[PDB]
Amino acid sequence: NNAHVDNEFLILQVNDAVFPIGSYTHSFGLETYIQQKKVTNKESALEYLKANLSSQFLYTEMLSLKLTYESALQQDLKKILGVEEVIMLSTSPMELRLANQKLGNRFIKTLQAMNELDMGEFFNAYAQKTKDPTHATSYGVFAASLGIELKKALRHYLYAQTSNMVINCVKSVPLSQNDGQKILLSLQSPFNQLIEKTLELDESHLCTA
Amino acid sequence: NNAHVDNEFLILQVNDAVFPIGSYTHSFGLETYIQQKKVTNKESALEYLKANLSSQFLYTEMLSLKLTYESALQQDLKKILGVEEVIMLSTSPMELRLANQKLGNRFIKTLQAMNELDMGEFFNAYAQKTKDPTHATSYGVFAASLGIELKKALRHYLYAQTSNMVINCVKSVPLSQNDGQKILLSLQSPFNQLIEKTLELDESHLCTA
Incomplete structure (x- = not known):
């Protein structure tokens, strides 16, 4: 059924900012760091981002993606729902939980609206x-x-x-666009470290940050 | 010098809509098709996009990318400048030519501003x-x-x-966001056809559409 689908393009399509699912919720956590003078420049933004990436974003978001991927390969829906339960019961405040649930629902619905894609x-x-x-x-x-x-x-x-x-940092601090690009370049080695760490973690680490 | 650079992330970074080089210029050509009733719905937008992709976008933009890539591997700067000369001398109207030159200059400058990237x-x-x-x-x-x-x-x-x-079509026609995603999915096979055709073309085809 998916002979006309190319995963090499579909992965770009679903990660594009225009994929119509609403805004990511990372700005929620950042708002306090700017008002309270913690994030003020490129260097402190970089520090904040590295810290965030390696804490809740790693032990909740990245890890949860790995866990449901692996469980889906095993056709273990019970484990997937169990993971989602842990996350829901661990997320604060309620406004962020609701925003996260909305984003997940919209991701699923946007895929399902593409009737010529068979998700299986x-x-x-x-x-x-x-x-x-x-x-x-x-x-x-x-x-x-x-x-x-x-x-x-x-x-x-x-x-x-x-x-x-x-880009939230660039707009909110604010920073120059060039500083944004320098930060993204500086994060490439951290990115590889994060992916390798994600592959080492399991359910016992979920939501532990 | 580029040991800390990961091309797998850098290629995402430079193609991201936030890469700070200004807007792409495809909307220039589309403006007439909407006012004059040619592009009115998902089906006619898809038709327009397939036609555009396989004409000037292929024989000028895609082909030029292949040509300067190949010439760069040969360290043939003369040929690169020759390609840019052909394009400049073929592009109308002048407003679009100037917008295209601005975009190219900004792409180069944005790369050069990332001092920790060695372009060679x-x-x-x-x-x-x-x-x-x-x-x-x-x-x-x-x-x-x-x-x-x-x-x-x-x-x-x-x-x-x-x-x-x-997205220009989605905003300008206008279309639903879901129609935008259906169009992008429908274009995946055309995309592969376009890449394979690009690899068959050479300088003799440049700007011939």
Whole structure:
């Protein structure tokens, strides 16, 4: 059914800022750091981003993507829903939880609206049953369902999220556009460290940051 | 010098809509098609996009990217400048030519502002000598200079440009966001056809559409 679908383009399409699912929620956490004088320049923005990437973003978002990808390969819907339950029961404040659930639901619905894309029965079942989807967990199931390699799936998702984080810093601090690009370049080695760490973690580390 | 640079992330970074070089110029050509009732819905937008992609966008933009990539591998700056000369002497109207030159200059300058990225001597020389850079021609030299595979370089550039074309249609016609995503999905096979055709063409085809 997916002979006309090229995963090499589809992975760009679903990570594009124009993929119509709403804004990522990283700006929620950043808002306090600017008002309270912590993030003021390129250097302190870089510090904040490295710290964020290696804490909650790693132990919740990135890890959850890996876990639901791996569980989807095993057709273990119970484990996927279990992961989503842990995340929901750990996320504060409620406004952020609701924003995250909205984003996950919109990701699933936007895929389903593309009627000429067959997500397969396991994804169909996941979409029918999910109560607390997130962008990362639904994306993990999506990537596994289409046979997209895990490391690649992680790279594209990580870059897209981080581009959003950096542009939030550029607009909110504010910084020059050139400082934004220097930050993104500086984060490439951290990105590789983060992906390698993600592959070492498991359910026992979920939401532990 | 580039041990800390990962081309797999850099190619996403330079094709991101936030890469600070200004807007792509595809909307210039589209403006007439909407006012004059040609592009009115998803189907006619798809028709217009396929036609555009396989005409001037192929025989000027995509081909020029391939030509300057290949010439950069040969360290043939004369041929690169020759390609840019042909394009400049073929582009109408003057407002679009100036917009294209501005975009090419900004692409080069934005790369050069990232002081921790070494583009290499050949790129340095190209940047010193170029008179009529374009985004596609400068990107070709950039990709070859960093050892990014041609097909990959073409895929990321083609997707980014087409995402811009489709969102212009979504906003200007206007269309629903879902129709935009259906169009992008429908263009994946055309994309592969376009890349394969680009690899068959040479200087004798440049600007012939």
